[model samples]
Target: LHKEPATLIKAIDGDTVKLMYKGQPMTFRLLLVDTPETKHPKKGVEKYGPEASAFTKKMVENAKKIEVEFDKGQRTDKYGRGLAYIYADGKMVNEALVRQGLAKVAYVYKPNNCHEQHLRKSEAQAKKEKLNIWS
Candidate 1:
């Protein structure tokens, strides 16, 4: 189901967001994007980790309405949860995180595709801008 304009309630973690849709709690992941892991048990935090979360939080804080876009005929991953593109005030949240050099494109199981290409471009730009978390 497409998420109508909604307000962001909180950011749950690196890849999850909590939002209020029609007074109900809803969670979604930014499609085609992944940031440094904050949920790991042994790995050290990567660079720009906190910055990524903070950036997303600022973008969503007090947002009155958000737009959610999903792939046609493709809704959930193997976990039976919804997958979607989230936008606030006409801003694409997934791309925004990448544009700011906070997140990277990550396709866990799908073949290299258009979405992957977009992410690659974002990575290139981020690299050019020296946004690498490793650096």
Candidate 2:
């Protein structure tokens, strides 16, 4: 994996973070995980959304260093957001969330799934324990 230094500006949601990358502000949509919805007009907060959001917020806010890794596939979305694996203080935030069942593997497309094996394995472990979304 190729890691690029980053500075977290905000955790927009459990699965999305805003940061500074390559001397400019960038938005990252976590590579392969989706947490429950945190807010919606008609849906209210999806179950466990608060937990997911807070967990991401806490991790990013306290991380000593943040970085992003781009895979061999797509690097950005039509929405102009960056796509990559996110790390905080050397921890893979994407897997951490899935391991806790706060997120599930998603948005996987072709070679963009460089971390799919680990992400799926972590989710499987969380499933075995029936954590959060798995419950």
Candidate 3:
């Protein structure tokens, strides 16, 4: 937790971001959320995939203060990347992605479930509204 603001450097799909935090390069996988795979085969990609990426970029385009929160669960996914709950201006960016229907709930194995319920709710709401990615 350096004193510097989190800077968004790259958009990895719609839910993940490459950021510079405290002057250290880090990749954040939006916690408790998952965006429809834009380039998946079986799931067959969804609409507005590109829009989701653009939307995410616009949200944090030049944000100077990107704040992050982490759960008590294991940190740093298998790939050794820092896993965290990202926020900006009091809004949970991971949940925001689902709120905008740009992402869904996805788990790698057995659902560690630190925030699965919340993710599910967001996904449901997005589905109900036919949010961009689902549309």
Top candidate (TM-score) = 2
Write model 2 residue lDDT over 8-127, tens digit each, in one string.
888888888999998899888888898997776868789999999999999999999998999998799999999988889989999999999999899889989878898889998999
* CA lDDT, candidate 1, residue 56: 78
Clashes of each: 1, 0, 2
Worst 10 residues of 2 by lDDT: 36-45
Give the best candidate by lDDT. Answer: 2
C-alpha-based local distance difference test score of model 2: 0.90
lDDT of 1 by residue, 1-135 (tens): 344666677886666788766687777777788887655666756666677877777777746568777755566666645577778787778887887677877774453233556667777887788865634
TM-score, structure 2 vs. true? 0.95
In terms of lDDT, model 3 sits at: 0.70
Worst 10 residues of 1 by lDDT: 108-117
| TM-score comparison, 1 vs 2, better candidate | 2
**Clashing pairs in model 2?**
none
What TM-score fits each model?
Answer: 0.78, 0.95, 0.75
For 1-135, candidate 3 gives per-residue lDDT tens digits of: 322257777867777788887788888777666665566687666676777777677777656567766666766787766677777666677788878877767764433456677877878988998877666
